[PDB]
C-alpha cells in the first residue's frame, strides 16, 4: 500500500534455530542481555517479531513475494491423492487395446 503494509510480521531474534517444519508463535521478549528483564521491552530486551511495511515504491529486492510449498511424501494407507487419469473415445466393432 502507498502508506505501507505493516500487517506482515517476521521473527528477527530467537534463542536457537528452529527445527525443520517447526512453527513458533511465541512473542516473548528475547533476552539479549544478562537479566530476564521481567518481560518488559527495554534496553537489551527487544521484541522478537518485526514488521515489513511493504510499499509500491520499494525495489524488486524488497517488494513482497508470496511463497508456497506444496509438499508430497510416502506412508501406508493408500490415497485419493492421484492425478486425473484422462480418457479417450468409445469405438465399437473393432478390436483395440483397452
Amino acid at each position: 500500500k502507498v502508506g505501507g503494509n505493516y500487517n506482515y510480521l517476521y521473527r528477527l531474534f530467537r534463542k536457537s534455530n528452529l527445527k525443520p517444519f517447526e512453527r513458533d508463535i511465541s512473542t516473548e521478549i528475547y533476552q539479549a542481555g544478562n537479566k530476564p528483564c521481567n518481560g518488559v521491552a527495554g534496553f537489551n530486551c527487544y521484541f522478537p517479531l518485526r514488521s515489513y511495511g511493504f510499499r509500491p515504491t520499494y525495489g524488486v529486492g524488497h517488494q513482497p513475494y508470496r511463497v508456497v510449498v506444496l509438499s508430497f511424501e510416502l506412508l501406508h494407507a493408500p490415497a485419493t491423492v492421484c492425478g486425473p487419469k484422462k480418457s479417450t473415445n468409445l469405438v465399437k466393432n473393432k478390436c483395440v487395446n483397452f
Binding site: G53, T57, G59, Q63
Partner: protein
C-alpha cells in the same frame, strides 16, 4: 553473552528501524522537493523530526557499550558512526547559543542585500544580478565596487557571529576528545584499528601540503598566463610581475575561473565542441539522453537502472504547476528505491549532468547490500569523484562521435584540444589553491595559531602567497571575507573539493590503464572496457565497510592520495603554457598591491 552479541543484536534492530524511518523521511523530502506545497512541507517536517529523534535516542542507547572490548571492525565502525555524541556533549545553553548563531549566520548570508549609492532603491541580492555582474561585467570600477560592498556588508555583520562560532565549535569538539573542530572535521579520513591501512588525522594536512607542493608549478604558470592575458582587457590596473586583483577572477570569491574563458581564450576563432544544435536537429529529449547514459554505463559493465527509476524519477520539468527544485539531484530513498530529480533540457551541460547523476546512482546502488550505517561512500570525496569521472569520459570527442552526436566528418585538432584543456583547468586546477588556502586558514583558526586580532591579515597574506590574489583596497579587521562564502558561513567542510579533485584524476588514470589507452589522459574513454568497470565496481561495492585507503588501493593501487595523475592530465596544457609563458616573468610579487 559477551558485549559483542548485544552490540550485534542492537545493530540489527537499529538497521531495520532506521532503514524504515529513513525511507519514510527520504520519501517525504522527495514529495516536498518534487512538489512545493504546505502539505508536503508538513510531511517533510514531521518525518524529519521523528527520524532525527529516533536517531538521537538510538545513539543515546548506543553509548552504553564501552567499544574497547569489541573486536569486529564492522560492528566497531557501525558503533563509531552511531555512538558519536555530537553537539549534545556541551551544556544546553551552549547548544542553544550555537544553534542561534548558525541560524542567524545562514539567514544573514541568504537574506543579505546590498544598497548602492547609484539610487536609493536599486538594491540587488547575491544570487541574481550580483553574480551576473561579477561574471560578465567588463568595467573595472563596477565589479570592484560590487566585490567590495558585498564583503563590507556581509562580513562586517558576520564577524561578531564568527567570533562566537569559532570558540563554541572549539569547546564542542575538544569535549569530544579532539583537539579542535578543525581536527573533528579531519576525523572523516581517520583510519584506525587496521595496521597497514591506518591513517591519522594529522597526516591529512602533511599529505595535502605535499600534493600542493607539486600542484604549485602548473598553477603558477596558469596564473602567469591568465595575468598576461588580462592586461589587455583590464589595462592600467594589472602588474607585469605583481599579483592579480580579487575582483578580476570572474566570481564574487574567485572560487572558479570559468567566467575568464571569454577573456583568456587561446584561439577564439574556432568555437568549442558543442553538440547542442546537433541534438535538437535529431529531436533529442531527456528520455533519450538518459537512455544513452544508461547504454554507456552498462557498456562499461555496470547493472541497469531499477524499473522504479524510469517510473518514479522526474527527469523533466512538468512546468510551473508542479513546482520543484530545478537542481540536479540523485535520490536514494532506500530499500531499492532510486530516483533522479533534474529539469533535463536539451543541452550538453544537461547531458554531462545526467551522466554525473547516473554515475552517482550507480555508486549508491553498488553498496546497497551494506548496513544502513555503512551505506555511504568511502569518504566525503569519493562519491563526487566517481560522479565526475563519468562526465569526464563522456565529454570526450570520441564518445560524442561514437553515439552519433558528433559528425564523423570532423577530426579533432591541437587547437581545440588546447582550448578544452585550458577551459577545464580554469575550474579544476584553478580552484585547488583557493580550496587549499581556505582550508588551511580555517584549520589554523580552529587550532588557535592565528590570534583573534590577526584573522583578516593572515587571510590576505596567505591569499597573496598561495593563490597570488591581492586585495583591491585596504581592509579593516572588522571585515570578514571568509564568512562571505557559503561553505564557511553555513558550517560546511571545504577540503572535500580538494581531495575529491585529486581522487578524480587518480581514478581516471587508474581506469585508463585497464582500457589499454594509447593517447593522452584527456582523450580516454572507459566505454566498452569491462575490466575497468569491474575494477571500479569492486570498490564501489565496498562503500564504507572498509577503510578509504583500502578502497583506493583496489582501483588505483596506492594506499595514499596522489596528485601525479592530475599533473599528467594537464601535461600537454602545461607544456603549451610553458612555451607561451616566456613573454613575461613567471610568478608574482606579493609585496605589490593596486593601492
Amino acid at each position: 553473552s559477551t558485549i559483542e552479541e548485544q552490540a550485534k543484536t542492537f545493530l540489527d534492530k537499529f538497521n531495520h528501524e532506521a532503514e524504515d524511518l529513513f525511507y519514510q523521511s527520504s520519501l517525504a523530502s522527495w514529495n516536498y522537493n518534487t512538489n512545493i506545497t504546505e502539505e508536503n512541507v508538513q510531511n517533510m517536517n514531521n518525518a524529519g523530526d521523528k527520524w532525527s529523534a529516533f536517531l538521537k535516542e538510538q545513539s543515546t542507547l548506543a553509548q552504553m557499550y564501552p567499544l574497547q572490548e569489541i573486536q569486529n571492525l564492522t560492528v566497531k565502525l557501525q558503533l563509531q558512526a552511531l555512538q558519536q555524541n555530537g553537539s549534545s556533549v556541551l551544556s544546553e545553553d551552549k547548544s542553544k547559543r550555537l544553534n542561534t548563531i548558525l541560524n542567524t549566520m545562514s539567514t544573514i548570508y541568504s537574506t543579505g542585500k546590498v544598497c548602492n549609492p547609484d539610487n536609493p532603491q536599486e538594491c540587488l541580492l547575491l544570487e541574481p544580478g550580483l553574480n551576473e555582474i561579477m561574471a560578465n561585467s567588463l568595467d573595472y570600477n563596477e565589479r570592484l565596487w560590487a566585490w567590495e560592498s558585498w564583503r563590507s556588508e556581509v562580513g562586517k555583520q558576520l564577524r561578531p557571529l564568527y567570533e562566537e562560532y569559532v570558540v563554541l565549535k572549539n569547546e564542542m569538539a575538544r569535549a569530544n576528545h579532539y583537539e579542535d573542530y578543525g581536527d573533528y572535521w579531519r576525523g572523516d579520513y581517520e583510519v584506525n584499528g587496521v595496521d597497514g591501512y591506518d591513517y591519522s588525522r594529522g597526516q591529512l594536512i602533511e599529505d595535502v601540503e605535499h600534493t600542493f607542493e607539486e600542484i604549485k608549478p602548473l598553477y603558477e604558470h596558469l596564473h602567469a598566463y591568465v595575468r598576461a592575458k588580462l592586461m589587455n582587457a583590464y589595462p592600467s590596473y594589472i602588474s607585469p610581475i605583481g599579483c592579480l586583483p580579487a575582483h578580476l577572477l570572474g566570481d564574487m570569491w574567485g572560487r572558479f575561473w570559468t567566467n575568464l574563458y571569454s577573456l583568456t581564450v587561446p584561439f577564439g576563432q574556432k568555437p568549442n565542441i558543442d553538440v547542442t544544435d546537433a541534438m535538437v536537429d535529431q529531436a533529442w529529449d531527456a528520455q533519450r539522453i538518459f537512455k544513452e547514459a544508461e547504454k554507456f554505463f552498462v557498456s562499461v559493465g555496470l547493472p541497469n537502472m531499477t524499473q522504479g527509476f524510469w517510473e518514479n524519477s522526474m527527469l523533466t520539468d512538468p512546468g510551473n504547476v508542479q513546482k520543484a527544485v530545478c537542481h540536479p539531484t540523485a535520490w536514494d530513498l532506500g530499500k531499492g528505491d532510486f530516483r533522479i530529480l533534474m529539469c533535463t533540457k536539451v543541452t550538453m551541460d544537461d547531458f554531462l549532468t545526467a551522466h554525473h547523476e547516473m554515475g552517482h546512482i550507480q555508486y549508491d546502488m553498488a553498496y546497497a547490500a551494506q548496513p544502513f550505517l555503512l551505506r555511504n561512500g568511502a569518504n566525503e570525496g569519493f562519491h563526487e569523484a566517481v560522479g565526475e569521472i563519468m562526465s569526464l569520459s563522456a565529454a570526450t570527442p570520441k564518445h560524442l562521435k561514437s553515439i552519433g552526436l558528433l559528425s564523423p566528418d570532423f577530426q579533432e585538432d591541437n587547437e581545440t584540444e588546447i582550448n578544452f584543456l585550458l577551459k577545464q583547468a580554469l575550474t579544476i586546477v584553478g580552484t585547488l589553491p583557493f580550496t587549499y588556502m581556505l582550508e588551511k586558514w580555517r584549520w589554523m583558526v580552529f587550532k588557535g595559531e592565528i590570534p583573534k586580532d590577526q584573522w583578516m591579515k593572515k587571510w590576505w597574506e596567505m591569499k597573496r602567497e598561495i593563490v597570488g590574489v591581492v586585495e583591491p583596497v585596504p581592509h579593516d579587521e572588522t571585515y570578514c571575507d571568509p564568512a562571505s562564502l557559503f561553505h564557511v558561513s553555513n558550517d560546511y567542510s571545504f577540503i572535500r573539493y580538494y581531495t575529491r579533485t585529486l581522487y578524480q584524476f587518480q581514478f581516471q588514470e587508474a581506469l585508463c590503464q585497464a582500457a589499454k589507452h594509447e593517447g593522452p589522459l584527456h582523450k580516454c574513454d572507459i566505454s566498452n572496457s569491462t575490466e575497468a568497470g569491474q575494477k571500479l565496481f569492486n570498490m564501489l561495492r565496498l562503500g564504507k565497510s572498509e577503510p578509504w585507503t583500502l578502497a583506493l588501493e583496489n582501483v588505483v593501487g596506492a594506499k595514499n592520495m596522489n596528485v601525479r595523475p592530475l599533473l599528467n592530465y594537464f601535461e600537454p596544457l602545461f607544456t603549451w603554457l610553458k612555451d607561451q609563458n616566456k613573454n613575461s616573468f613567471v610568478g608574482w610579487s606579493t609585496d605589490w598591491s593596486p593601492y
